[PDB]
Design a protein around this nucleic acid. Structure first.
Length: 58
DNA sequence: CGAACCTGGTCTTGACTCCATTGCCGGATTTGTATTAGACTGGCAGGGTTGCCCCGAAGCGGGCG
């Protein structure tokens, strides 16, 4: 079905596999963080420039 | 009988030639680095074949605390 932790346990146990091919390992690694939009990019760029000026001032 | 001679070299002096050998210098080519603002967001991809043997690891029946 879609619940009762059978499919959930299957997805969890299939997440903790070997994946001996290094390309598949790196792709499963990078398919983790959430993608962003233009507002998130604006926010992160402003935070980056603020942090850079703050550490240069320090 | 002596005497010129003539010619092996042995060697030097002086002028001449000629080509390496750096040295700038001006320009040519060669090589390296930086920068491009619309938006773009998790692979293609190729095969699976023997026989025999040894041995080491995974997993399952079976009793035990």
């Amino acid at each position: 079905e879609d619940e009762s932790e059978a499919l959930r346990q299957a997805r969890k146990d299939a997440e903790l596999t070997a994946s001996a091919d290094s390309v598949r390992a790196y792709l499963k690694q990078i398919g983790k963080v959430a993608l962003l939009n233009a507002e998130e990019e604006v926010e992160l760029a402003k935070r980056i420039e603020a942090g850079l000026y703050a550490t240069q001032l320090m």
